[PDB]
């Protein structure tokens, strides 16, 4: 009911500030439910979008610079890949590694068999998603997660 208490809430208690909890120095909140399954399904390497679907998704984004990126496939027809569109969402230059650790790939020795792009590993650089499916391990409330690196 006052400006002092409104100031005290805005500055101290407000939700974008309750994100990484000191309860166990990992995020308190990450992507949940239905969206999380839809993000898995979306980042797979086989997803491709026509000019219309990309424009529609771009239209729903917020900080979008306004410059449609070049589709990963120019010919025979324009196609954007899933990871690519995701890279517009990832902030300025947030950069993780690893965090592939779902069932996929192998229980540690298979990937060292020279890295044959088994596609699981989640690599991002300069804030642009280079490869690999996103999941609870990347986006979840896990200590090493993407949401942790943005904050």
């Amino acid at each position: 009911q006052s400006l002092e208490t409104r100031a005290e809430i805005q500055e101290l208690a407000m939700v974008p500030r309750m994100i990484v909890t000191p309860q166990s120095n990992r995020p308190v909140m990450g992507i949940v439910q239905d969206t999380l399954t839809a993000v898995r399904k979306f980042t797979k390497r086989d997803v491709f979008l026509e000019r219309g679907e990309v424009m529609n998704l771009l239209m729903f984004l917020s900080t979008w610079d306004g410059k449609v990126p070049q589709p990963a496939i120019l010919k025979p027809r324009p196609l954007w890949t899933g990871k690519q569109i995701f890279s517009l969402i990832i902030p300025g230059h947030i950069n993780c590694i690893r965090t592939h650790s779902t069932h996929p790939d192998d229980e540690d020795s298979g990937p060292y068999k020279h890295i044959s792009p088994g596609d699981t590993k989640v690599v991002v650089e300069n804030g642009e998603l280079i490869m690999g499916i996103l999941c609870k391990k990347s986006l979840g409330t896990s200590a090493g997660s993407l949401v942790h690196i943005s904050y």
Binding site: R51, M55, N56, L58, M59, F60, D65, G66, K67, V68
Partner: protein, 117 residues
């Protein structure tokens, strides 16, 4: 109770106007059209007529919140051609396709059928 009267879904408000145009500053030559009291029925069609046009660089619409009757259309064109003209033309063009569709339909009904009325 807090539920709007259902007619408030489509009647324009006396202090409102049907369309509003605001420039975008992020990129040169671009526009943002606000369509009030309209829905996917209108929004989705205008998107497709604009994308048909080859001078249009970008076109898209988004209904900002489901409980809130309003759509926004972002369109961007080449410097050589105003984005507003493409929108006006896109409607007229669309009006023409539906008119031809209506004439062909009535005539098709007029084809040797019985009980047509």
């Amino acid at each position: 109770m807090n539920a709007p009267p259902a007619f408030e879904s489509f009647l324009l408000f006396e202090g409102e106007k049907k369309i509003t145009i605001n420039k975008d500053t992020k990129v040169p030559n671009a526009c943002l059209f606000t369509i009030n009291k309209e829905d996917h029925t209108l929004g989705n069609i205008i998107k497709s007529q604009l994308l048909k046009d080859p001078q249009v660089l970008f076109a898209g619409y988004k209904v900002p919140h489901p409980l809130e009757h309003k759509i926004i259309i972002r369109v961007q064109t080449t410097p050589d051609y105003s984005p507003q003209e493409a929108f006006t033309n896109a409607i007229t063009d669309l009006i023409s396709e539906l008119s031809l569709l209506e004439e062909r339909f009535r005539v098709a009904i007029k084809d040797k059928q019985e009980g047509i009325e």
